[PDB]
Amino acid sequence: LLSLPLVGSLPFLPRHGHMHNNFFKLQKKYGPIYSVRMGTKTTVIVGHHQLAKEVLIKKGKDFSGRPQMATLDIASNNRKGIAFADSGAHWQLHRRLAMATFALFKDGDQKLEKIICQEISTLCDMLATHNGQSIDISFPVFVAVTNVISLICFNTSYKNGDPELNVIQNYNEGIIDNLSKDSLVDLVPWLKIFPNKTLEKLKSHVKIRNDLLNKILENYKEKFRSDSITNMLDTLMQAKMNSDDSELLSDNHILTTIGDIFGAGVETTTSVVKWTLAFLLHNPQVKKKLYEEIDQNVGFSRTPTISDRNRLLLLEATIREVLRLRPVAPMLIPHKANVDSSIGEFAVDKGTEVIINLWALHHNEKEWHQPDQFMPERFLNPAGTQLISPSVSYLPFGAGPRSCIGEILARQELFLIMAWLLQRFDLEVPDDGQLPSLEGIPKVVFLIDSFKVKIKVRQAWREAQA
Ligand code: HEM
Ligand SMILES: C[C@]12CCC(=O)C=C1CC[C@@H]1[C@@H]2CC[C@]2(C)C(c3cccnc3)=CC[C@@H]12
């Protein structure tokens, strides 16, 4: 009896479980590096820190490309910007000038710590109004970080109640929802197989994004002066002015680079904040030790600062642990081989897609003690006095040419937001008793389901107000 002709084979079902965990579970059968082919495309998935550090860092330049996808073309205005732009002159110039802009907040009256705390102060005033009520804190945080990144990009902020904030939220959500059905890695290209309206819907939200930032740019060409460079749009048009490189710095190149910075600065930081609160609702013991730590190292005399990370070490460890258990990009952003090369002595051809399964690195049982569990302690020494790097299999912000350029801002935003909130607010399960689901929702970012938290002004903070 004969065996059937096989014209197709996939190791696991499409749309069943998170794909970063489906690739991870496949390592027990096929090892830490394997490939999948779909038509002409071959994709390599890497799930061990050694091979990952080879792709990102040792041969970083060889694998610094980004694959072309119809959906990412639209959000990037055909691969301009930074994150979805391929390797080459465009990407390298704008990333540098984007990273050069962050240097401008070293110290002064426009210090990054001072810009963060200015918006956090308004945030906590708005949250204090909800004393005794259960709310979704997504939007208040969204406003806070949106103003920070808009200050870094334009030296402008939005006043309370500005409708543009709700317009931005609407398109942010619309773009994320249509950029990918689940994570960016789609095994099967469903979008070109059946009639859908995903590209059309995505174009609609991106047009609103582009139109909104185009108007801002135009208005700013009258305000720009070469003698004053204080934000990222100043930095980039300074470059355009100076090259008089020119093709690289058109208005749509400048707009798209801002769009990447605007989008990343809001959606990542807002997301990690919600994740941390969700974990603290699930672990009151860890939550209480954070209250005890901050009362003993900062008290209520003053508000937190960036220097307090030297003594708020359980807080810094808690943030580290969320970025491990629930990485913002559990499979980073897809990489591509820019030239013929090798991974683990295995051949990888030019143009091949390469994906680092950061989820596999952060949940490897040989590199981590009980990787399923939430344990900020793992990042602290046994006496709780010094922070440690317990594992070399940890790259929350990537590494190499494609590493994250907003890491510094992110770690400051995350540390200061949770410090100010823990100082001032009790953060408890709502009256219904529902705890947030920690399963997550994989999109281009690893999001959490909306949830509510009962927020109360702490008594110890009040009593210090006399
Ligand atoms: C917890 C906060 C954040 C995390 C965990 C995070 C993590 C990452 C990771 C893992 C990557 C990709 C690495 C790779 O593709 O190989 C990335 C890319 C990037 N991140 Fe972040 N990020 C965060 C916040 C931010 C912020 C606030 C910005 C502000 C601009 C930012 C800007 C970027 C950009 C521009 C890229 C693309 C880099 C490139 O393609 O060259 N990120 N992020
Ligand atoms: C999709 C996105 C959000 C919605 C929006 O309205 C505008 C866009 C375009 C720019 C996108 C952004 C989301 C995050 C992106 C993908 C990314 C990233 C990913 C994970 C950690 N840090 C950074 C770099 C560029 C960013």
Side-chain angles (χ1 to χ4, degrees), residues 72 75-76 82-84 168-169 171-176 179 184 205-206 209 256 258-265 267-269 328-329 332-333 396-397 404 444-446:
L72 297 162
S76 63
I82 300 165
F84 303 145
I168 295 163
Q169 170 210 45
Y171 74 60
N172 268 213
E173 155 155 350
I175 291 162
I176 289 167
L179 199 66
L184 284 170
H205 297 277
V206 166
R209 196 279 304 270
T256 308
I258 298 296
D260 278 12
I261 306 289
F262 217 90
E267 289 295 344
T268 61
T269 50
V328 179
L332 312 180
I333 295 172
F397 293 89
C404 158
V444 61
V445 168
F446 195 10

Side-chain angles (χ1 to χ4, degrees), residues 135-328:
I135 63 156
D136 186 351
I137 48 67
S138 299
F139 192 76
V141 180
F142 173 86
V143 173
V145 289
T146 282
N147 280 341
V148 175
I149 209 66
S150 151
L151 286 164
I152 297 181
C153 289
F154 313 134
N155 283 117
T156 68
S157 65
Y158 289 105
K159 270 288 317 185
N160 235 344
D162 202 321
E164 202 150 293
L165 281 163
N166 304 293
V167 175
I168 295 163
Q169 170 210 45
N170 183 283
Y171 74 60
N172 268 213
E173 155 155 350
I175 291 162
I176 289 167
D177 279 349
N178 296 277
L179 199 66
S180 59
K181 170 41 180 137
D182 282 327
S183 54
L184 284 170
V185 184
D186 218 332
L187 285 179
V188 191
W190 300 111
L191 181 64
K192 280 179 173 208
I193 293 171
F194 301 113
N196 60 99
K197 293 179 179 179
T198 319
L199 292 183
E200 173 211 300
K201 292 207 271 207
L202 178 59
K203 283 184 207 171
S204 148
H205 297 277
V206 166
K207 175 171 190 311
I208 299 173
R209 196 279 304 270
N210 293 332
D211 282 359
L212 176 146
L213 297 179
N214 251 323
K215 86 166 170 174
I216 283 174
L217 295 219
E218 290 290 316
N219 273 359
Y220 200 83
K221 310 215 262 232
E222 327 166 10
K223 304 170 200 101
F224 173 66
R225 303 268 194 296
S226 320
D227 66 70
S228 189
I229 295 314
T230 39
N231 55 55
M232 209 203 253
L233 191 65
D234 281 340
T235 296
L236 287 131
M237 56 207 320
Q238 177 168 257
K240 166 64 178 249
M241 192 149 281
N242 270 358
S243 77
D244 158 31
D245 257 36
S246 167
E247 73 171 309
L248 307 179
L249 287 158
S250 94
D251 281 322
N252 214 255
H253 281 88
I254 293 189
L255 179 142
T256 308
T257 297
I258 298 296
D260 278 12
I261 306 289
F262 217 90
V266 182
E267 289 295 344
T268 61
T269 50
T270 290
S271 190
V272 174
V273 172
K274 286 161 65 173
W275 268 112
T276 303
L277 293 174
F279 274 109
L280 297 188
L281 291 180
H282 277 270
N283 307 265
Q285 66 290 349
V286 174
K287 182 175 70 179
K288 176 209 210 142
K289 304 213 284 259
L290 289 156
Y291 285 129
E292 271 154 12
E293 172 169 81
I294 189 172
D295 291 340
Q296 173 86 2
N297 283 276
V298 178
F300 304 95
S301 37
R302 52 171 186 85
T303 45
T305 36
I306 274 300
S307 45
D308 296 309
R309 59 208 318 196
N310 296 331
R311 295 163 273 296
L312 267 42
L313 295 183
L314 182 58
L315 176 56
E316 265 301 355
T318 298
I319 294 175
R320 287 181 183 195
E321 177 69 344
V322 171
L323 299 176
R324 185 197 61 86
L325 248 173
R326 301 287 183 271
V328 179

Side-chain angles (χ1 to χ4, degrees), residues 384-448:
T385 78
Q386 203 89 40
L387 286 153
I388 66 187
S389 304
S391 172
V392 297
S393 208
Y394 183 61
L395 306 162
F397 293 89
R402 286 289 183 163
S403 102
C404 158
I405 62 178
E407 174 172 356
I408 290 160
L409 171 72
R411 311 197 107 118
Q412 289 198 50
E413 280 189 350
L414 289 182
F415 175 79
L416 301 184
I417 288 169
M418 307 294 305
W420 281 57
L421 288 167
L422 286 162
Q423 184 184 50
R424 197 161 171 174
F425 296 122
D426 275 304
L427 304 167
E428 294 162 16
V429 175
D431 289 337
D432 55 42
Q434 287 182 268
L435 288 169
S437 179
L438 303 172
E439 194 184 302
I441 307 191
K443 301 297 279 185
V444 61
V445 168
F446 195 10
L447 305 165
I448 196 174

Side-chain angles (χ1 to χ4, degrees), residues 355-379:
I355 282 93
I356 316 274
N357 192 343
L358 186 58
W359 177 268
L361 272 45
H362 292 189
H363 283 85
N364 178 358
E365 274 257 334
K366 302 201 163 201
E367 296 285 330
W368 301 96
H369 179 47
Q370 297 186 147
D372 289 1
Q373 246 209 293
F374 176 66
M375 278 194 286
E377 314 96 77
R378 79 177 67 242
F379 282 97

